[PDB]
């Protein structure tokens, strides 16, 4: 079957403390609003 | 052959002697029309100086939900001087300009409508050779 997964799986990019800012990252992620097959 | 600005646009065929013309392949910019996100979320997209019969291929037509040119077919297609507009409908009234498009076209969020701007109301004043007003 198929199942939707809306906003999950975001992981910390690196190991540097960042305090209340907005940053740009280029990294592999789970695309938002994807069909996740169910077995 | 070449041009007045050092560019080349004519080349002869080296097997069957004939002339050919060279035209640059299409390019242009993409603009987005959004009413303030504090009020809604609907948007529209404009492509500059292109026939929109040629814009399922101008951008690669690959996205989960395309950039609200949803696999860009369907209704809401309008051809203006500034290009093609997808995501709005045409009306036959006139109002004040909210967001400018170009060459006399303005778009507003009431969905999204496109219209021609109006310069004001019409007034006719009586003129004679023996009349005044105080």
């Amino acid at each position: 079957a198929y199942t939707n997964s809306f906003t999950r799986g975001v992981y910390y990019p690196d190991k540097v403390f960042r305090s209340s800012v907005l940053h740009s990252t280029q990294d592999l992620f789970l695309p938002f609003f994807s069909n996740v097959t169910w077995f | 052959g070449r041009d007045i600005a050092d560019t080349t646009d004519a080349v002869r065929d080296p097997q069957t002697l004939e002339i050919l013309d060279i035209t640059p392949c299409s390019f242009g910019g993409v603009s987005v029309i959004t009413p303030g996100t504090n009020t809604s979320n609907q948007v529209a997209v404009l492509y500059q100086d292109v026939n929109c019969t040629e814009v399922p291929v101008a951008i690669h037509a690959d996205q989960l939900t395309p950039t609200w040119r949803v696999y860009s077919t369907g209704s809401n297609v309008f051809q203006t001087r500034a290009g093609c507009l997808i995501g709005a409908e045409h009306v036959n009234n006139s109002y004040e300009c909210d967001i400018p498009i170009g060459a006399g076209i303005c778009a507003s969020y009431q969905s999204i409508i496109a219209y021609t701007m109006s310069l004001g109301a019409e007034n006719s004043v009586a003129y004679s050779n023996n009349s005044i007003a105080i």
């Binding site: - | 041009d3 007045i4 600005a5 050092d6 560019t7 646009d9 640059p24 390019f27 242009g28 910019g29 500059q48 100086d49 001087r81 500034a82 400018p100 170009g102 060459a103 006399g104 310069l119 004001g120 109301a121 019409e122 007034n123 006719s124 004043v125 009586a126 003129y127 004679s128 050779n129 023996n130 009349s131 005044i132 007003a133 105080i134």
Partner: protein
């Protein structure tokens, strides 16, 4: 003195410019991904250049709006014309043409006078917001309003009054009694008509009148041509085509051989942008002066010496022209 004469003069001022846009990556690196990877090391110069160009672009529409939009109603002219002997045929709209322009505007429109290369390297021309038809409508509305009412439609609701009474009042505004005009009506009307005819004759026979706008057009064209001609220089490298450098040497040398060209083209773009800004400042100053003149000479009578005309001011009329305006005093 014992006698008097009525004169008409002309005055020309530019308002707006042409709206252009340039794309960095296409102008510099063409379509080679290696050049883009190399350029990614220089920061955010190109966003700055694009922002400056867009800022310049919006200002022309701002200037045109400031100049030509003073009333908020469109006024009509009566179909019957008997103004006591005054003939306004040479400035009123002509209904027997598809453009709806006065003969003087038609004469002005016909007097003012690489394309693929601009379309090639990432140069585009953006269209204006107000078409010429709308500007003509604005001008006709202003003319009708001043002909039928006077100075009363600039401070409130319009009020009607016959033209000879308006002329007598304007005569009273400079220190001459009313009975002077009422006993010399036909002579004044004839002098007005002769002056208008002479104005058209002088305009249509001396080409050295519309040089101010031609100067701006030529300046922009020269700047663009100078920019485009710079894509054939070495600056220090062994060639100027990227493909030859790619096909002749291994990447380590092509690196520096491309760096030289990148630096040169960046410098050229910087110079172009700076010159454009410097020009835009003077254009804006001219636009502000024109707006003030329109406010103060068309909607009232001015007491400042040598501001609206040459002599004692009576009235003025506006006319449209490509990227500018024309005044008759």
């Amino acid at each position: 003195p014992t006698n008097f004469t009525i004169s008409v003069t002309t005055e020309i001022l530019p308002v707006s410019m042409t709206k252009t846009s340039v794309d960095c990556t296409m102008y510099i690196c063409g379509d080679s991904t290696e050049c883009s990877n190399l350029l990614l090391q220089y920061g955010s110069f190109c966003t700055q250049l694009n922002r400056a160009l867009t800022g310049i672009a919006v200002e022309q529409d701002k200037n045109t709006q400031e100049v030509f939009a003073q009333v908020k109603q469109i006024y009509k002219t009566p179909p019957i014309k008997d103004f006591g002997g005054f003939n306004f045929s040479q400035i009123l709209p002509d209904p027997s043409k598809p453009s709806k322009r006065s003969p003087i505007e038609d004469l002005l429109f016909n007097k003012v006078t690489l394309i693929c290369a601009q379309k090639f390297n990432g140069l585009t021309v953006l269209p204006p917001l107000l078409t010429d038809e709308m500007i003509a409508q604005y001008t006709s509305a202003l003319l009708a309003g001043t002909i039928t009412s006077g100075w009363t439609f600039g401070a409130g609701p319009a009020l009607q009054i016959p033209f000879p009474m308006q002329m007598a009042y304007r005569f009273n505004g400079i220190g001459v009694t009313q009975n002077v005009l009422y006993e010399n009506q036909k002579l004044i009307a004839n002098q007005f008509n002769s002056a208008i005819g002479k104005i058209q004759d002088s305009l249509s026979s001396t080409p050295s009148a519309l040089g101010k706008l031609q100067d701006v057009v030529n300046q922009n064209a020269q700047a663009l041509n100078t920019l485009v001609k710079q894509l054939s220089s070495n600056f220090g490298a062994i060639s100027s085509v990227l493909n030859d450098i790619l096909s002749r040497l291994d990447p380590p040398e092509a690196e520096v051989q491309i760096d030289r060209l990148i630096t040169g083209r960046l410098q050229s773009l910087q110079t172009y942008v700076t010159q454009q800004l410097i020009r835009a400042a003077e254009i804006r100053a001219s636009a502000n002066l024109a707006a003030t003149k329109m406010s103060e000479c068309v909607l009232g009578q001015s007491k400042r010496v040598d501001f609206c005309g040459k002599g004692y001011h009576l009235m003025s009329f506006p006319q449209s022209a490509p990227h500018g305006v024309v005044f008759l005093h």
